[PDB]
Amino acid sequence: MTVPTPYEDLLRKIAEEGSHKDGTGTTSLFGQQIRFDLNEGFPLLTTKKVHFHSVVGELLWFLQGDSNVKWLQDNNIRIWNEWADEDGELGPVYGVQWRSWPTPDGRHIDQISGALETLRNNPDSRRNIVSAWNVSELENMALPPCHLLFQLYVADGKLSCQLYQRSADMFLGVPFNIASYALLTHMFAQQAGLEVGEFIWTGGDCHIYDNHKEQVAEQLSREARPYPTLELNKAASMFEYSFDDITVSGYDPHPLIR
């Protein structure tokens, strides 16, 4: 009464008032913001089929902090393949910065387990930040980080997460990005015994490619169903979740577009 549509709302807004940049064309707006109350449903979009298994597998692998694509393939996820080299290696992308941001001693920082310690010990911390925008290592990455930083925050025993995402393919990328951080934020809350607050997605260039005009125009005509809800069995730590611990229930998306 009704179902919130912060995503489709932004989707629409860009199509109507985005300006046009020019190897295929786009219409963009800059600096937008989406937010979901996580208690209020799991934000896996229903106006089109968002494949959740790959959302989950990417995340578990981000969390392993490994830069070889193997474990994805071994688990039937090929979304990173095209960027891998012959040996299946991508450079120090997302997970690698997250678990092992290198320092000029011999060592590395684990911002994930870092971030966890400060949830448990200091929830009011105003500096609970993970970053993958490691300026000095970008040259070595297959692809410069897109969703490049997020911040954790606690109010009334409820965890919120904000994501800064530099560039957003509204149609193909975003929905997938938001389901992935919504899940990570659920994992964080569970591993520190807290309820879930909001996920805030904040973007730079939020864009629709010209070749999505018809597809977007379509999704935009469908009415939303209620969001599914997330079922999460508690693993022993952030780094020991498996596919079996993670399911959505009551997910009834409209059919895929594309």
Ligand X SMILES: O=c1ccn([C@H]2C[C@H](O)[C@@H](COP(=O)(O)O)O2)c(=O)[nH]1
Could you tell which of ligand X, a copy of itself, none binds residue 99, using a CB distance below 5 to 8 A set by kind? none
Contact (CB, 8 A) for 87 and 105 = no
Q: How far is the CB of 127 from ligand X (least distance, A)?
A: 5
DSSP for 28-92 reads EEES-EEEEEGGG-----SSS---HHHHHHHHHHHHHT--BSHHHHTTT--SSGGGS-TTSB--S
Three-class secondary structure of residue 109 per DSSP: strand
111/129 Cα distance (integer angstroms):
8
Q: Which residue ranges make up the site for a copy of itself (CB under 8 A)?
A: 19, 21-22, 28, 30-31, 33, 35, 97, 101-104, 109, 111, 124, 126-127, 129, 131, 133-137, 144, 148-149, 151, 153, 155-156, 160, 162, 164, 166-167, 197-198, 200, 202, 204-205, 207
Catalytic residue among 15, 109, 146, 172: 146
Q: Is residue 186 a contact point for ligand X (CB under 6 A)?
A: no
* Ligand-binding site membership of 35 (annotated): no
Contact (CB, 8 A) for 190 and 28 = no
* Ligand-binding site membership of 209 (annotated): yes
Q: How far is the CB of 10 from a copy of itself (least distance, A)?
A: 13
Q: How far is the CB of 214 from ligand X (least distance, A)?
A: 18
146 has catalytic annotation: yes
Residues that bind ligand X (CB under 6 A): 126-127, 144, 146-147, 167-169, 173-174, 177
Question: Can you say which residues are annotated as belonging to the binding site?
Answer: 51, 126-127, 166-169, 177, 207-209
